Amino acid sequence: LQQPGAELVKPGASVKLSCSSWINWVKQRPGQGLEWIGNVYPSTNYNEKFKNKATLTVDTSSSTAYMQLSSLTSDDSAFYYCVRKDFPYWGQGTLVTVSAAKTTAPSVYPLAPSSVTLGCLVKGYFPEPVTLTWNSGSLSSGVHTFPAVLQSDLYTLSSSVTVTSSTWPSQSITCNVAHPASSTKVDKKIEPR
Amino acid sequence: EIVMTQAAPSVPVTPGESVSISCRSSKSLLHSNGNTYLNWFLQRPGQSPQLLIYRMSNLASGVPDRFSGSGSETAFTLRTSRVEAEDVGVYYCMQHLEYPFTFGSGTKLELKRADAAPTVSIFPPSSEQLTSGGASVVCFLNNFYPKDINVKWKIDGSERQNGVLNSWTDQDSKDSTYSMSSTLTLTKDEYERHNSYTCEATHKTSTSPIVKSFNRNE
Ligand SMILES: O=C(O)CCCC(=O)N[C@H](Cc1ccccc1)P(=O)(O)OCC(=O)NCCc1ccccc1
């Protein structure tokens, strides 16, 4: 199930999220719980609390389910996942950010110094989220990725990676930063200082 | 509608030990067809919930044998046996007996481990940031325990509190430790007018703080 990574919508605006089974939609505020919105069968079922706020449809042609959220408010900012029930298959989810701020791609700065620690600084982006990895996922063991923090309308995030010192810079390491909202990904190979 | 309750935000457990997560519904989840519509999911930061148990006591495929589910018609329990570091996360129960489907509040699994001192690293601003006029000095205090920790920035000896933003990671799924990142931001103008930059980690594992510093000139 393919779902856009993010949608920045102006407050008061509407937005239509894209995605023999039931396609369900679930809402979740960052760091919060899970709420069931409703579902469709490409008959619909709405959670009474979400009637109207949400409108569920499906395009058999392109085979994609849609949920339209109307006149969004801060309360509406949350991850929305579509999950197919035949083992339900959860989607990657779309993080909807309701704000009047404009989308701003991040600046990605490399951070170089028995083990050695390299880092990656991701500054000034909006809105969330960003998907950071190292060597496109090859490295995970020595990884620490700190939750972004909002400061003056801009998010800032860092990530560190620790590896056997004798293997860097000899065995190259690269920071990868995806920013769905701005549709840009950036790779910064960490070089010795 | 049906209310799912989880009377515990989090639960503590020593690695290797067993533990139980509880959940309750406001009505019997047992359908006349003999089945009991209760799911148990696990969610790790930045990931969608992963299925662990279906129909109250059925181990989902791919999930280690260490997980098991049981219950009455309104009380449900998820047992995690021989707990491991990778088990950290939030567990949710969910009923799908009736529309609207409802989820319990979730219970976060927290590992009680041995104390660990932080490994501190300091990074000067990158040349790319300087060319844009900003100067961020970054310090990583990695793999420590307990979670509580303090950082202190100093410039040429004077403590600097403004332009400092910190961020803690969730409990590490590898070694069950915690980490924190501290960033001091200045303009190049001011960054170029001071020489020594220092961050100081003060954790329970020690009286005197772990300090790291560098000199723009050196
Ligand atoms: O009115 C009724 O009798 C039941 C309505 C709900 C329902 O049909 N749930 C089904 C189970 C069931 C089967 C037989 C008898 C009773 C219940 P169901 O869970 O297959 O419903 C289909 C569906 O869309 N399920 C979504 C489950 C799900 C949604 C979001 C996240 C994770 C899981």
Side-chain angles (χ1 to χ4, degrees), chain A residues 1-86 88-193, chain B:
Chain A
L1 302 179
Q2 301 297 302
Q3 280 192 278
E7 289 287 349
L8 163 55
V9 334
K10 249 112 183 66
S14 59
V15 75
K16 175 181 295 190
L17 305 185
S18 57
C19 179
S20 155
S21 324
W22 284 97
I23 297 299
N24 297 256
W25 294 90
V26 175
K27 167 185 190 178
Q28 176 175 225
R29 294 190 177 76
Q32 310 280 205
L34 302 145
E35 268 193 293
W36 177 75
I37 293 188
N39 76 12
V40 66
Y41 193 82
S43 184
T44 69
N45 288 282
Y46 285 100
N47 174 329
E48 288 289 341
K49 291 180 170 68
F50 288 96
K51 282 205 300 214
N52 256 92
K53 161 66 65 177
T55 287
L56 315 177
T57 62
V58 301
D59 186 302
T60 57
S61 320
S62 62
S63 213
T64 168
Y66 300 107
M67 166 166 65
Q68 169 176 291
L69 299 188
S70 60
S71 63
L72 286 68
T73 184
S74 298
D75 300 335
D76 292 316
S77 289
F79 293 90
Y80 290 91
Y81 311 90
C82 54
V83 35
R84 172 241 296 152
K85 224 295 283 188
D86 297 333
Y89 185 108
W90 294 68
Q92 25 190 187
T94 298
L95 170 59
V96 181
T97 294
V98 179
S99 168
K102 84 173 179 66
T103 178
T104 296
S107 277
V108 176
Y109 306 117
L111 300 189
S114 69
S115 76
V116 63
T117 291
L118 311 182
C120 195
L121 181 55
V122 185
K123 200 171 181 52
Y125 68 99
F126 192 93
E128 285 265 48
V130 303
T131 290
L132 186 151
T133 56
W134 286 92
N135 280 352
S136 322
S138 292
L139 301 173
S140 66
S141 304
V143 175
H144 291 322
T145 308
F146 313 85
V149 185
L150 181 59
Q151 164 71 274
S152 311
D153 276 284
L154 285 184
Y155 282 102
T156 280
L157 173 154
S158 51
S159 178
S160 72
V161 62
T162 304
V163 304
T164 302
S165 48
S166 71
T167 74
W168 185 79
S170 55
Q171 297 178 228
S172 115
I173 291 180
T174 302
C175 179
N176 319 135
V177 171
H179 188 232
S182 73
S183 298
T184 85
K185 309 184 167 180
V186 46
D187 305 301
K188 300 285 290 193
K189 164 179 178 180
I190 313 305
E191 303 296 344
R193 240 188 236 285
Chain B
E1 52 196 60
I2 301 185
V3 176
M4 296 306 292
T5 310
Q6 284 187 71
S10 58
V11 305
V13 73
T14 288
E17 301 305 312
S18 283
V19 81
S20 301
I21 303 187
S22 315
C23 172
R24 294 195 177 189
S25 50
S26 66
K27 185 241 269 283
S28 165
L29 307 190
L30 176 67
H31 184 277
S32 68
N33 59 41
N35 297 321
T36 292
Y37 301 83
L38 183 284
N39 293 126
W40 273 112
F41 297 96
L42 154 59
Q43 181 180 45
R44 304 195 192 80
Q47 291 181 22
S48 47
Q50 67 158 298
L51 184 62
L52 299 168
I53 307 291
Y54 64 97
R55 286 188 283 197
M56 185 179 68
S57 49
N58 292 73
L59 187 68
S61 289
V63 180
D65 202 31
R66 300 182 300 100
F67 295 77
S68 67
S70 69
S72 62
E73 303 194 10
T74 57
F76 319 99
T77 303
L78 169 82
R79 256 264 144 173
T80 306
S81 190
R82 301 176 290 276
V83 171
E84 304 178 1
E86 200 198 297
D87 296 329
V88 294
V90 185
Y91 293 76
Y92 300 78
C93 52
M94 187 210 102
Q95 70 80 22
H96 56 120
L97 171 70
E98 318 190 340
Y99 282 127
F101 301 142
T102 49
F103 301 83
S105 305
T107 297
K108 186 180 296 180
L109 179 39
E110 296 173 23
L111 283 293
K112 321 167 83 306
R113 57 153 287 156
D115 279 21
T119 293
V120 188
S121 295
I122 187 170
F123 298 86
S126 64
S127 61
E128 294 102 307
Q129 180 176 30
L130 293 172
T131 312
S132 80
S136 291
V137 183
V138 181
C139 264
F140 293 139
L141 288 62
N142 299 333
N143 301 90
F144 57 84
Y145 186 91
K147 183 178 172 75
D148 289 56
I149 198 168
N150 307 290
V151 182
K152 182 190 287 187
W153 286 94
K154 290 184 179 178
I155 302 186
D156 283 351
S158 300
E159 178 174 346
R160 170 51 174 275
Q161 266 176 43
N162 318 47
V164 177
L165 286 174
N166 316 312
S167 166
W168 275 258
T169 64
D170 287 287
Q171 178 159 39
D172 189 273
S173 52
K174 295 291 189 295
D175 64 359
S176 309
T177 61
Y178 289 88
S179 289
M180 185 228 124
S181 174
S182 178
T183 299
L184 172 61
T185 297
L186 314 152
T187 56
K188 179 208 297 171
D189 202 331
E190 294 194 326
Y191 171 66
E192 304 184 305
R193 295 179 192 259
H194 303 295
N195 193 65
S196 190
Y197 290 92
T198 304
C199 78
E200 297 174 358
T202 296
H203 182 275
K204 159 194 177 192
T205 45
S206 161
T207 308
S208 28
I210 312 290
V211 314
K212 283 289 180 298
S213 62
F214 61 85
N215 305 315
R216 199 160 47 70
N217 73 314
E218 200 179 317

